[PDB]
Design a protein around this ligand. Structure first.
Ligand SMILES: COCCN(CCOC)c1nc(C)nc2c(-c3c(OC)cc(Br)cc3OC)c(C)nn12
Lengths: 263, 160
């Protein structure tokens, strides 16, 4: 009755949220690609720093690419069926999510080192952190799903289940360490490198201004994932649209961030 | 990047060691004293470090001692009459590769490469790399020599 009319009103708004997410993800993907080819054409791709940038962009490409395959996973018949390719698709998306955290940390390792110590060889340690450390973490996560939580294509949320901390705990830990780095870069930039005009110092200043802008942009969407707003009609609709706009345009935010640093 | 450059091909150690001849050294190859006594090696260290006198030092401390040696190497370069005119005509990335060479063979050794220096001073960077590879130095430490040579030819850090 009127209950059904209320049910139909929510399906339309969810279908609207779904449209915002699909269009934001297409625009983000094209943008990352256009940034990626701009970096590869440059003869400055030999600079360690541009090596770091190209790997970050690539990392966000694979994630946004596999988001499309994930949507095809969210069919409820597929969700319950627990097919092999279905769990494999979920671990792929999780692996790429971890790499995005470890590559943002990598940029923070380079910037703290570049302002304290005066390229093709040093990059391997960054590639070892960005792509390498994540692989055993996802693997350990997977064995934990297999022995203990083999359901819902590994995308189920269930209470009292700590299995997802195997990979989530690391993501928080490197973020903690990037905060210490930020405080040290600012601490250093304001006392000892106050008057420096060396080329590494001007670049450092441009980063810290940019990082201060991107951090609230990217940070909001993560705290919103804890909100639990409620069944209030007006509060619920705004919660769903804002969160869908922030998650989908995220890669677009990153591509602007990356090209700005090319200067 | 010069500190990163030399840390790569020379090496970095943060507690006092003794070299093949038996003196006390630290860092990227900072000789502390020729005296047998370990005591004097720690004291000579204390005056330089200007902090707690101990066998272990700060990685930052290593770069401040590294800077000291980079200073003395440049004073040596500029006193040498074959080395000096090639150095001023070179740019920064190419100077590092000249200092890299002095750290390895001394100002006297780099002066032996008489053809390659006139090539570097004429910007003839492709000609100089063939000269420096026909040499016993290239045969004895090839992996370091190939890195240094490429920096000369391109003037970038891509190799390190
Ligand atoms: C809150 O998550 C935002 C996005 N994120 C995880 C996944 O990305 C989509 C992330 N993870 C890490 C681990 N660090 C950072 C920084 C950062 C920094 O924050 C302390 C310090 C310094 Br110094 C540099 C930074 O990045 C360049 C920024 C700006 N985002 N970010």
């Amino acid at each position: 009755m009127e209950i059904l009319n209320e049910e139909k009103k929510s399906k339309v708004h969810y279908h609207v949220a779904a449209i915002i997410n699909y269009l934001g993800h297409c625009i983000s993907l094209v943008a990352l690609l256009v940034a990626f080819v701009l970096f590869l054409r440059a003869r400055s791709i030999r600079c360690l720093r541009n090596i770091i940038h190209a790997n970050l962009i690539a990392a966000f490409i694979l994630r946004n690419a596999t988001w499309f395959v994930v949507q095809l996973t969210m069919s409820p018949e597929v969700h319950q069926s627990n097919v092999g390719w279905c769990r494999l698709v979920t671990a792929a998306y999780n692996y790429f999510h971890v790499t995005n955290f470890f590559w943002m940390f990598g940029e923070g390792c380079y910037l703290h080192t570049a302002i304290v110590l005066t390229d093709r060889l040093r990059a391997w340690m960054f590639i070892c952190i960005g792509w390498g450390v994540p692989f055993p973490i996802i693997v350990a996560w997977a064995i934990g799903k297999l022995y203990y939580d083999n359901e819902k294509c590994w995308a189920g949320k269930r209470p009292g289940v700590y299995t997802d901390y195997i990979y989530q705990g690391p993501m928080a830990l490197v973020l903690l360490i990037n905060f210490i780095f930020l405080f040290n870069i600012v601490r250093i930039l304001m006392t000892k490198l106050r008057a420096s005009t060396t080329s590494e110092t001007i670049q450092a200043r441009k980063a810290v201004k940019a990082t201060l802008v991107l951090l609230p942009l990217l940070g909001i969407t993560y705290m919103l994932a804890f909100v639990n707003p409620g069944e209030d009609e007006v509060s619920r609709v705004v919660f769903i649209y804002f969160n869908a706009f922030l998650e989908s345009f995220q890669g677009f935010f990153v591509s602007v961030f990356a090209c700005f640093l090319n200067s | 990047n010069i500190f990163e450059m030399l840390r790569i091909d020379e090496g970095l150690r943060l507690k006092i060691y003794k070299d093949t001849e038996g003196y006390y050294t630290i860092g990227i190859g900072h000789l502390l004293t020729k005296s047998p006594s370990l005591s004097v090696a720690k004291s000579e260290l204390d005056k330089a470090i200007g902090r707690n006198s101990n066998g272990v030092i700060t990685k930052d401390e290593a770069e401040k001692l590294f800077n000291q040696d980079v200073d003395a190497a440049v004073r040596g370069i500029l006193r040498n009459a074959k080395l000096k005119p090639v150095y001023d005509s070179l740019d920064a990335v190419r100077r590092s590769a000249l200092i890299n060479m002095v750290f390895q063979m001394g100002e006297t050794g780099v002066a032996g490469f008489t053809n390659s220096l006139r090539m570097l001073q004429q910007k003839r960077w492709d000609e100089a790399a063939v000269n420096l590879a026909k040499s016993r130095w290239y045969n004895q430490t090839p992996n370091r020599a190939k890195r240094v040579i490429a920096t000369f030819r391109t003037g970038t850090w891509d190799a390190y």
